[PDB]
Design a protein around this ligand. Structure first.
Ligand SMILES: Nc1ncnc2c1ncn2[C@@H]1O[C@H](CSCC[C@H](N)C(=O)O)[C@@H](O)[C@H]1O
Ligand SMILES: Nc1ncnc2c1ncn2[C@@H]1O[C@H](CSCC[C@H](N)C(=O)O)[C@@H](O)[C@H]1O
Ligand SMILES: O=Cc1ccc(O)c(O)c1
Ligand SMILES: [Mg+2]
Ligand SMILES: [Mg+2]
Lengths: 242, 238
């Protein structure tokens, strides 16, 4: 619609970090992440760092953390909501077993096609079923077709932040009991800690309010147990109880 | 000796402000913290070594990790008043079993009433000893059927690398080894750091050596996580 520009340059928060020290973040990346980062993940990240929406790219240390969760819980079928150039998707496909399957959802397939050659060189494209659509209609259609034996083990939500609570209502029924739902960016550059934060783009302010509401909802939701983790831009792990 | 304290690292917060950390604790931790964990934490904050108490948001994450991997047999090295131990016992199933090792049982007795009131004392086998002899004796007695699903290391920091050599044999393949404090209050990010107590400086040097060792170790895959004082999760590959 008409109005204000909403590109990455129009945002105010992209350079703000949740860690106190930029040196500490760089130490973590150079000591414990890059030596453990798949060669195709490196290439995918380096191209994405030059893309016009580079700030949306998931943090590399968070990527290795998501991989660790997937392997430790022996995930086999996963769903990803928000693919962009595919760094978390390629991370997920490399973590799953040979016969693992991923449902990847994003409104923009041209983003996915930037990383697709790296995913192909890694040899894990066969695991991925990409769906070019808005996530919410796809999730609602799944609620009409998916049977108990096909529930997902793991869900990574990293798409349009104001819709997280809406995705949550579907994902607590699409993920198996004891499965995991991970919401990205639940600390939103640290702005969630304040009731009001000046100097934000309208979309950044909307995400601050939605995340402040989401973090309260998730902490009070009896259907899941949660753990908020201050890695990357913050994430919240949910484990379905019933 | 009496003819010879005063430390620099007391407050755990690697986030950009006190406000952000307090927001996480009040919004996402305290409403999910067990009441006996709350009682244990509040009395431990009055203890003279309260700086050693595990970060509460880090404890909730340990609980999440134990359930997601369905751990049943765990080992903890470094108990103190027992916050992470009680966190573990509350997360395991009713038949879960924990081997808890610490050199000082008087610390463990501070949290034992809370563990008992929580009804999970039956899951814990506490061993008052230095951990390295106990682990070495485990390497001669334990069989493949008795391997641990999960290990939490939170004891004397310069011994972490030595613990690692034992635990990559005592934790099952695909099991987890978790090390607390691998970011050591942020000090590991610098080759030199001024004004540290000699013991705090020795831990900084050891963690810088440990972090490089773990990242080069082909026996495990790692993930270092900037939560609390930093933790490194290790998954045994073979
Ligand atoms: N309503 C919607 N439904 C599905 N995808 C959406 C959406 N709104 C935005 N998106 C997509 O969500 C993505 C968020 S960026 C995601 C980052 C990516 N997971 C990584 O690892 O780096 C964008 O690619 C955007 O196209
Ligand atoms: N060599 C050793 N073997 C076993 N435990 C040791 C040790 N050296 C120190 N410790 C113990 O390790 C503990 C570190 S403090 C650990 C904090 C605790 N895990 C929590 O949840 O808060 C101390 O209680 C100390 O007594
Ligand atoms: O001994 C000091 C200390 C400080 C912080 C810790 O997390 C810990 O385990 C020990
Ligand atoms: Mg994100
Ligand atoms: Mg510690």
């Amino acid at each position: 619609g008409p109005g204000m520009g909403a590109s990455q340059d129009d945002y105010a928060l992209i350079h703000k970090n949740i860690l106190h020290s930029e040196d500490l973040l760089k130490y973590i990346l150079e000591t414990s992440v890059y030596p453990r980062e798949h060669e195709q993940l490196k290439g995918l990240r380096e191209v994405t760092e030059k893309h016009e929406w580079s700030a949306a790219l998931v943090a590399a240390d968070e990527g290795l953390f998501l991989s660790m969760l997937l392997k430790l819980m022996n995930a086999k079928r996963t769903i990803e909501i928000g693919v962009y150039t595919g760094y978390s998707l390629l991370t997920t496909a490399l973590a799953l077993p040979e016969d693992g399957k991923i449902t990847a959802i994003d409104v923009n397939k041209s983003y996915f096609e930037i990383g697709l050659p790296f995913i192909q060189k890694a040899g894990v494209e066969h695991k991925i079923n990409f769906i070019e659509s808005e996530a919410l209609p796809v999730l609602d259609q799944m609620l009409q077709e998916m049977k108990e034996e096909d529930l997902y083990d793991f869900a990574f939500v990293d798409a349009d932040k104001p819709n997280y609570a809406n995705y949550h209502e579907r994902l607590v029924k699409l993920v198996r009991v004891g499965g995991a739902i991970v919401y990205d960016n639940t600390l939103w550059f640290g702005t969630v800690a304040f009731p009001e934060y000046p100097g934000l783009h309208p979309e950044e302010e909307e995400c601050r309010v939605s995340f402040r509401n989401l973090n309260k909802l998730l902490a009070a939701d009896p259907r899941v147990e949660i753990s908020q983790v201050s890695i990357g831009d913050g994430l919240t792990i949910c484990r379905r109880l019933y």
